[PDB]
Amino acid sequence: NTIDVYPGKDFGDDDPQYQQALKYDDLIAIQKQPWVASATPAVSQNLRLRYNNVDVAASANGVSGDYFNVYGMTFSEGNTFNQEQLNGRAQVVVLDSNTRRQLFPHKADVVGEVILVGNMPARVIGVAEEKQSMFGSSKVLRVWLPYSTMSGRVMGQSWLNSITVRVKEGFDSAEAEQQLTRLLSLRHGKKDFFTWNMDLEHHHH
């Protein structure tokens, strides 16, 4: 009914070698299948975070900030983006627990710190805790900014977190998922991704 496609083998696989599994050309190929109503990517930008002498690759996502709820992430410090930050395109950032450890190993509190997100300074407004979330903790360094702040900023190189494929009404969704899987295995020469098929009504994330 809707089918998510994810890179790698298991939930939580965002290691470097999996980030490039799903291609824009794959999205376009899916989009042309006759059983597909629509197919949408979720995209991160890879950039570098700079704080003092730390300079590290990270994946940044622009989110709408009900985002943390729907994935089961809570905040160990600070909070999610408020309405003015979202409307105002504010230069503010939420850290994952890996990023927080990397940049601020010693600090008791990091809310109010400023980091460079690529070439854009951003005030840290919270730290998200991923360990009890749907997919567990990241294997890489993740940050989140307001979607509006990210839109039109070419902050770095994009990769596909996932592709969500809506199946046309009345089509057999198990067979759809099998066709999707054949299509992509053939384009890749292997099964380096996995799928999660569900009721549109349950796709709350």
Are 47 and 155 spatial neighbours (Cβ–Cβ below 8 Å)? yes
Query: Would 171 be classed as within a structural domain?
Result: yes
The structural domain count of the chain equals: 2
Q: Do 80 and 18 share a domain, yes or no?
A: no
Rounded distance between C-alpha atoms, residue 84 and residue 109, angstroms: 23
Q: Assess contact for 137 and 18: CB atoms under 8 A.
A: no
**Tokens of residue 57, six digits:** 């690759």
Residue 13 in domain: yes
88 and 57 part of one domain:
yes
The widest CA-to-CA distance across the chain, in whole angstroms, is 56
- Return the closest-CA partner of residue 138 out of 25, 28, 18: 18
**Resolution in A, one decimal?**
2.0
Please tell me whether residues 56 and 146 are part of one structural domain: yes
Residues 54 and 151 both lie in one domain: yes
Q: Which residues pair with 126 in a beta bridge?
A: 78, 94
In a domain, 205, yes or no: no
CATH assignment at residue 38: 3.30.70
On whether both 77 and 53 belong to a single domain, the answer is: yes
CA distance 28 to 37: 13
- DSSP, collapsed to helix, strand or coil, labels residue 51 as strand
Instruction: Give the Cα separation of 156 and 99 in Å (integer).
Output: 17
Could you give the residue ranges of the DSSP H alpha helices within the chain? 16-19, 24-31, 67-71, 83-87, 97-103, 147-150, 173-188
Whether residue 204 lies inside any domain: the answer is: no
Shared-domain flag, residues 114 and 181: no
What experimental approach yielded this model? X-ray
Supply the range of the domain harboring residue 191: 2-42+159-198
Cα separations (Å) of 68 from 16, 75, 109, 159, 202? 23, 9, 20, 20, 17
- Residue 68 belongs to some domain of the structure: yes
**Cβ contacts of residue 26 below 8 Å, gap of 6+?**
160, 163, 184, 187
- Spell out the long-range contacts of 167-173 with Cβ–Cβ below 8 A and sequence spacing 24 or more: 167/1, 167/2, 167/3, 167/35, 167/36, 167/37, 168/34, 168/35, 168/36, 168/37, 169/37, 171/35, 173/1, 173/3, 173/197
Name the pairing type of β-strands 114-117 and 120-129. Answer: antiparallel
In a domain, 81, yes or no: yes
CA separation, residue 9 to residues 13, 79, 83, 130, 183 (Å): 7, 32, 37, 19, 17
Q: Residue 134 contacts by C-beta under 8 Å, 6 or more apart in sequence?
A: 11, 71, 72, 205
